[PDB]
Ligand binder design. Structure first.
Ligand SMILES: N[C@H](Cc1ccccc1)C(=O)N1CCC[C@H]1C(=O)NCc1cc(Cl)ccn1
Ligand SMILES: *[C@@H]1O[C@H](CO)[C@@H](O)[C@H](O)[C@H]1NC(C)=O
Ligand code: NA
Ligand code: NA
Lengths: 11, 251, 28
């Protein structure tokens, strides 16, 4: 889990 | 990708990352074939031996990316899936025959310097380009070695291998819906797709109209970049009629 | 799709990428 968080809108 | 190189910016603007929502992780590669359709390997979405069976809401598509892990603000676009279509005769039980799937996006993606669709081959282009020795290009964010991860998109050029050589390299039954690519042991050069590159495009640049065509989909291999082994790719043209039927009916 | 396979940062500007020539040379 070395991924930068994506904007909440997409989740 | 094993033994490849960093992609240049905008070098593969059709490259798509399939991204799992929870936990957040790379699932597979894929490719953009129009503003609303993404092509990938069936086994990226459905593979019962490993309890893999993703639904539309499990996934996101990330387009225009270069960095593997970064959120590339103002550059990448992230899309939700409307519907997944897996080939009806995809053979997951045996050899991954017909390893191909389409994904329809909820909304059209905007093209940009970093986002642009690849062409799908017509019969003539396939006949002309799919020849032993002719090189294609494979791209992805998969493992750099069989047994870490790249910072950015990786690229490698690989020659198509003669069918008898492909068949003689493996105990797996190979079908007309697959081709193999990679260097022979004596050729000196190497390179291969690896875990995480599945679903990504094998592309060739037509010397006739100077356009890029996706001839293959990264499908399977035994290990990565092993001497005497080759990567196997779904033969996109052989499955084109199914692709068109899906896009025609559901487009 | 009329514009498919032509990259904005390469073909559209007549710039070549660093290894595409390797592909062309293999199309004998
Ligand atoms: N190791 C298996 C070989 C195999 C082949 C047919 C049927 C079952 C198992 C494999 O590649 N895969 C089993 C699951 C999906 C696929 C894979 O990992 N594919 C990634 C890949 C692709 C390529 Cl071209 C080179 C290296 N690794
Ligand atoms: C995969 O998921 C869908 C929905 O849950 C299900 O209908 C299907 O039977 C599952 N297994 C497959 C396609 O092998
Ligand atoms: Na064999
Ligand atoms: Na090999």
């Amino acid at each position: 889990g070395d991924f930068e968080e994506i904007p909440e809108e997409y989740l | 990708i094993v033994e490849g190189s960093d992609a240049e910016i905008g070098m593969s603007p059709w490259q798509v990352m399939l991204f799992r929502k929870s936990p957040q992780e790379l699932l597979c590669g894929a490719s953009l074939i129009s503003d609303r359709w993404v092509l990938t390997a069936a086994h990226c979405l459905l593979y019962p031996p490993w309890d893999k069976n993703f639904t539309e809401n499990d996934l996101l598509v990330r387009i225009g990316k270069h960095s593997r892990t970064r959120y590339e603000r103002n550059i990448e676009k992230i899309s939700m899936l409307e519907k997944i279509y897996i080939h009806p005769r995809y053979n997951w039980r045996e050899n991954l025959d017909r390893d191909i799937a389409l994904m329809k996006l909820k909304k059209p993606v905007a093209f940009s310097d970093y986002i642009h669709p690849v062409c799908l081959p017509d019969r003539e282009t396939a006949a002309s380009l799919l020849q032993a020795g002719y090189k294609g290009r494979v791209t992805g964010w998969g493992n750099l070695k069989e047994t870490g991860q790249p910072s950015v998109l990786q690229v490698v050029n690989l020659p198509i291998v003669e069918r008898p050589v492909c068949k003689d390299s493996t105990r797996i039954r190979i079908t007309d819906n697959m081709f193999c690519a990679g260097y022979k042991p004596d050729e000196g050069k190497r390179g291969d797709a690896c875990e995480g590159d599945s679903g990504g495009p094998f592309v060739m640049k037509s010397p006739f109209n100077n356009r890029w065509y996706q001839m293959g989909i990264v499908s399977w291999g035994e290990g990565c970049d092993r001497d005497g082994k080759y990567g196997f790719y779904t033969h996109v043209f052989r499955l084109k009629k199914w692709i068109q039927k899906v896009i025609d009916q559901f487009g | 799709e009329a514009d498919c396979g032509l990259r904005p940062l390469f073909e559209k500007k007549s710039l070549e990428d660093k290894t595409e020539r390797e592909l062309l040379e293999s199309y004998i």
